[PDB]
């Protein structure tokens, strides 16, 4: 089953992106299963902000972030087989935009 935990990433972080900021992993889904990531920040606006590594389940950010655009990107993950079928999910994944030495409290 997809195991996940809120990913708290600091806003304003700059390039070079993309960069892994976490890992969604499945406890038992087929070793062939590759993960989908979806939600505001992925395929929902803001689009193309977060992308998970379909195979590793590594959640990666593609650019900087700001807490006023979204305080929490609520993504949704799904385990998919090489058949493209979803065997698990959609499960939710939350990416919260934390500050860094108070970037913008």
Curated annotation (Swiss-Prot):
Tissue distribution: Highly expressed in heart. In the CNS, expressed in cerebral cortex, medulla, hippocampus, amygdala, thalamus and substantia nigra. No expression detected in cerebellum or spinal cord.
Domain named Cadherin: residues: 1-105
Subcellular location: Cell membrane; Cytoplasm
Listed transmembrane segments: none
UniProt superkingdom: Eukaryota
Domain notes: Three calcium ions are usually bound at the interface of each cadherin domain and rigidify the connections, imparting a strong curvature to the full-length ectodomain.
Subunit: By contrast to classical cadherins, homodimerization in trans is not mediated by cadherin EC1 domain strand-swapping, but instead through a homophilic adhesive interface which joins two elongated EC1-EC2 domains through a region near their Ca2+-binding sites to form a tetrahedral, X-like shape.
Protein purpose: Cadherins are calcium-dependent cell adhesion proteins. They preferentially interact with themselves in a homophilic manner in connecting cells; cadherins may thus contribute to the sorting of heterogeneous cell types. May act as a negative regulator of neural cell growth.
Name this protein carries in UniProt: Cadherin-13
Source organism of this protein record: Homo sapiens (Human)
Gene transcribed to yield this protein: CDH13
């Amino acid at each position: 089953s997809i195991v996940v935990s809120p990913i708290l990433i600091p806003e304003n972080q700059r390039q070079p992106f993309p960069r892994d900021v976490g890992k969604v992993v499945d406890s038992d889904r087929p070793e062939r299963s590759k993960f989908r990531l979806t939600g505001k920040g992925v395929d929902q606006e803001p689009k193309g902000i977060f992308r998970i590594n379909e195979n590793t389940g590594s959640v990666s950010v593609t650019r900087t972030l700001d807490r006023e655009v979204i305080a929490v990107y609520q993504l949704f993950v799904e385990t998919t087989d090489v058949n493209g079928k979803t065997l698990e999910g959609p499960v939710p994944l939350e990416v919260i935009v934390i500050d860094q030495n108070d970037n913008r409290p």
